[PDB]
Each structure stands twice: as structure tokens, then as C-alpha cells.
């Protein structure tokens, strides 16, 4: 019967690893690098678009940075199509919470929910897991500014600074070196771009090969603003920090 053709996606190896999860992580390691840095007065999200073309319409393009709600955003590393499935689920979950409790969803609760969905695909159903790793950047009134990551295993952890995708080993070393606790957003912006500029596989880091976003309390009085940077605005911040 059909058993003959079943790959058995949800089994342990003799060493106690999940085959498909490990191979999904291998896929993600070839994806464009995404970096998240948390500061005292905000969060930075930086990400590298993969070998683009001159004929790609950049200003209407979005492959890395997505908005989950007004307070929370995500950087993607892996299969974009798989990520959009999860992103829409997270957007719905955030709205369900808001409808139920009349309060914006705490960041961790949203992260746990998505991570639980990923976990399910590794334990039951016989389907391949989602080949996606997220960096969650968000704010709530309990813990303030928060950075999380999740991977196909469905395991998630909190960070002060973190990278996913390609060259994370090199990127994490550079972040661990220059990061300090009393750091500010403007400094974190500079750190993120400098780290991408050194880890990138491209010849030079340009505006057309980047997606950038900040979450700042730099909004008029006690409130939070999400800024998805435009192509011209990425070009300006590259000149300001002294990369181009």
C-alpha cells in the first residue's frame, strides 16, 4: 500500500535527533542573514536580501521583515512561503487575544503559540516541518523591549542580541564583542549594519540588498512606533554610519 512511499518525517535518529528538524536548520543556514539587537530605548531589526537583481522592484518588495501587529515584528530566515503561512496565523492569534482580553498580546505569548505550532509538525501528522527561523522584535508593558528567536524544532529563547540564517557563528561572535548593556538604539543600528557588512557573502553592502526596521519609544510620549525603512532611508543610514 501507501506505507512504501512514506518518508516518516517525525522520528528520532539513533542519536536522539529529529532528522527533518536538523535538515530544515541546514536549509536555513543558506538563507540571508537576519540580525536583531535590543537596546534600552528600542530594538533594531536588520536583514540581508539574497542575490537581488537590478530589475527587482524593491520599494514594493518584502521578503525578510514582516509586521505582526503595531507592537511586534519579525525577521524571517528560510522559505518565505512557509513563513507567510505562520505569519498570518500569528496575526490572527494576536487579534484573537485582543478581542478576548481587550489588551495587546504580550510578546512571549505570541512567540510560544507559533513555536507550539512548529513543535506539532515534529511530533505528529507525518508532514514536513516549516523551514523557517524567526527573530521576534516586540514591546509590552510587562517586560518592555524583547527579542526572541524560534526555529523548526519549535524551541524558542530570549536574547539581547541575536542572528539567524547564514554566517550566524561569525555574526554572533562580532555581536558578543561590541555589545554592551547600556547601549542605545542609534548605536545598535550602527552595530547591526557593521556586523552584516563584515559577515556578508556579497562584495559590498548596498541599500538595495537590505531590509531594515526599528521599534522605538521614540514616538511622541509614552507609546511605541514601528518603522519599516524605505529604500532611500536605508541609503541615508548607510552613509551616516560610514559604510558607503
Amino acid at each position: 500500500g501507501s506505507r512504501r512511499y512514506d518518508s516518516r518525517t517525525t522520528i528520532f535518529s539513533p542519536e536522539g535527533r529529529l532528522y527533518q528538524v536538523e535538515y530544515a536548520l541546514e536549509s536555513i543556514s543558506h538563507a540571508g542573514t537576519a540580525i536583531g539587537i535590543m537596546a534600552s530605548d528600542g530594538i533594531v531589526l536588520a536583514a540581508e536580501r539574497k542575490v537581488t537583481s537590478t530589475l527587482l522592484e524593491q520599494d514594493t518588495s518584502t521578503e525578510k521583515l514582516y509586521k505582526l501587529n503595531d507592537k511586534i515584528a519579525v525577521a524571517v530566515a528560510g522559505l518565505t512561503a512557509d513563513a507567510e503561512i505562520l505569519i498570518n496565523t500569528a496575526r490572527i492569534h494576536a487579534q484573537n487575544y485582543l478581542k478576548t482580553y481587550n489588551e495587546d498580546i504580550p510578546v512571549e505569548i505570541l512567540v510560544r503559540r507559533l513555536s507550539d505550532i512548529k513543535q506539532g509538525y515534529t511530533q505528529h501528522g507525518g508532514l514536513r516541518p516549516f523551514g523557517v527561523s524567526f527573530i521576534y522584535a516586540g514591546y509590552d508593558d510587562r517586560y518592555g523591549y524583547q527579542l526572541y528567536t524560534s526555529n523548526p524544532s519549535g524551541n524558542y529563547t530570549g536574547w539581547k542580541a541575536i542572528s539567524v540564517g547564514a554566517n550566524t557563528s561569525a555574526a554572533q561572535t562580532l555581536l558578543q564583542m561590541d555589545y554592551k548593556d547600556d547601549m542605545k538604539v542609534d548605536d545598535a543600528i550602527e552595530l547591526a549594519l557593521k556586523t552584516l557588512s563584515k559577515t556578508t557573502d556579497s562584495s559590498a553592502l548596498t541599500y538595495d540588498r537590505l531590509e531594515f526596521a526599528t521599534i522605538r519609544k521614540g514616538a511622541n510620549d509614552g507609546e511605541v512606533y514601528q518603522k519599516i525603512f524605505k529604500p532611500q532611508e536605508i541609503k541615508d543610514i548607510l552613509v551616516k554610519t560610514g559604510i558607503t
Binding site: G1, S2, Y5, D6, S7, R8, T9, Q20, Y23, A24, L25, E26, S27, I28, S29, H30, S53, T54, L55, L56, E57, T60, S61, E63, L79, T80, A81, D82, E84, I85, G126, L127, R128, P129, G131
Partner: protein, 250 residues
């Protein structure tokens, strides 16, 4: 009986590759060339009508398809897969949008829905991926004109101009030299015909080429008068004669 294939047929290999998606992209590569170019006041999509037999009436086989009055689509790869995707794309435009908001979806969101259908064929049980890449050209009020590519993985990207299928690498190079941000629609049609001639071997005329545009509103194609706000479809398929007229000034 029962469908007992409740498991994925597309899985990650040790190298991190999704084999069936790669193989689907290979099928797209073998397919006939199709392209899309975006102008300031319009979009053009074009392809070759590769007739399987001269006894076959190639007019009955439509490679360029209307999805909504302001959105059109063309493909490269497996024709039957494209035909069912067009049926589903047309339906989802109504069920997931028009029946809710009372208006047709913007290009990017219809593309998003088509992409979702193609992603699910890449993860769901007992199915293979669609063996096609789509080029979807369209217009809407708040985003203006736009051109999107959709791949077997479900990934989609917006383009100023592009090409897919047999001679895509050469065609994309040709488009890079000719494309600028000040092109009028007629200039884009002219460039589309030049680009397409390079990939075609045999006859090159209005009967062997299929070409459609997203441009100005066509009140003559609306089918009724009396409502000022309803000005007609922006999608228009060029006739055999209309193509031949532009081949003389080529």
C-alpha cells in the same frame, strides 16, 4: 479505498534541499518562454503559442488568462497545472475577497492567495508541487500598476520586468538594457516583442504569439452603460491583427 497518502511527499534532504520543489523548477525551465514588462501607464505580459499540431486550433488554448477585470496571468511550465490554478485563482478572488468587501482584490493580495495554494501543495499530504511559475500583472487604485512572479515553492517577488522559462537568462539580460522608469505602454509592448523574438524559432506573427496588457479602462468592453464609477476592465488581450500592426514598425 480512502486517500491513505496523509504524509508529505516533499521533504528536506540532508543538504537542506526540498527535492520536489527543485524538480518542479526544472520542469518550469523546460517550459516555453514567457515575460512581463511594467510601464508608467501600464503592464504587458506575453508568451509564445507553441502549437502541438497544425491541425490543432491554437486559438482555443489560452496561455494568457483573465483572473479579474484588472488582473491577468501567464505561465511557463506544465499547462494543465496552470489551467487549474487559474480556476482556483478566479474563485478565491471571489470567495476570500469580493463576497466580503464588494470589490476585486488588489494584485498583491490575489498573488498572495495563489502563492498560498502553491505552498500548500508543497507541504500537504499526498500531493506534488505545481510544475509552473506564474507571472501576474495587474492594477489597483492604491498600489497602481504591478507585476509579480510566483514560483512552485509559493514564493513571490515584485518585478519591474522579467522573464521565465526556456530562454529566461538571455531574456532578462535583454530587458535590463532596455528598461527604464519613463517607458510608455507602447514602448513596453515594442520591447516585449523584441525580447520574445529571440526565444522563438519558427513563425513569429499574431497567430503564434499571445500578448495581453493591463492599461487604461475599456468602457467599450464593459457590456453596459449607466453607472459612471464603472468604467470597464483594464485587462485587454491584443488581437492577431493588433500584434501584426506593431510587427511592421519593429
Amino acid at each position: 479505498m480512502t486517500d491513505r497518502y496523509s504524509f508529505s511527499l516533499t521533504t528536506f534532504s540532508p543538504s537542506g534541499k526540498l527535492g520536489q520543489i527543485d524538480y518542479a523548477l526544472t520542469a518550469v525551465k523546460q517550459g516555453v518562454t514567457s515575460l512581463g514588462i511594467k510601464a508608467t501607464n501600464g503592464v504587458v505580459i506575453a508568451t509564445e503559442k507553441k502549437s502541438s499540431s497544425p491541425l490543432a486550433m491554437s486559438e482555443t488554448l489560452s496561455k494568457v488568462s483573465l483572473l479579474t477585470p484588472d488582473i491577468g496571468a501567464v505561465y511557463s511550465g506544465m499547462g494543465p497545472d496552470y489551467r487549474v490554478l487559474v480556476d482556483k485563482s478566479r474563485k478565491v478572488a471571489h470567495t476570500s475577497y469580493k463576497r466580503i468587501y464588494g470589490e476585486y482584490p488588489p494584485t498583491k493580495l490575489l498573488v498572495s492567495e495563489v502563492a498560498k495554494i502553491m505552498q500548500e501543495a508543497t507541504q500537504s499530504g499526498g500531493v506534488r508541487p505545481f510544475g509552473v511559475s506564474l507571472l501576474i500583472a495587474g492594477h489597483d487604485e492604491f498600489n497602481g500598476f504591478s507585476l509579480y512572479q510566483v514560483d512552485p515553492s509559493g514564493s513571490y517577488f515584485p518585478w519591474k520586468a522579467t522573464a521565465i522559462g526556456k530562454g529566461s537568462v538571455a531574456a532578462k539580460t535583454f530587458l535590463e538594457k532596455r528598461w527604464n522608469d519613463e517607458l510608455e505602454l507602447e514602448d513596453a509592448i515594442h520591447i516585449a516583442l523584441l525580447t520574445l523574438k529571440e526565444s522563438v524559432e519558427g513563425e513569429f506573427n499574431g497567430d503564434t504569439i499571445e500578448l495581453a496588457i493591463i492599461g487604461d479602462e475599456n468602457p467599450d468592453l464593459l457590456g453596459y452603460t449607466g453607472i459612471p464609477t464603472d468604467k470597464g476592465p483594464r485587462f485587454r488581450k491584443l488581437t492577431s491583427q493588433e500584434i501584426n500592426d506593431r510587427l511592421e514598425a519593429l
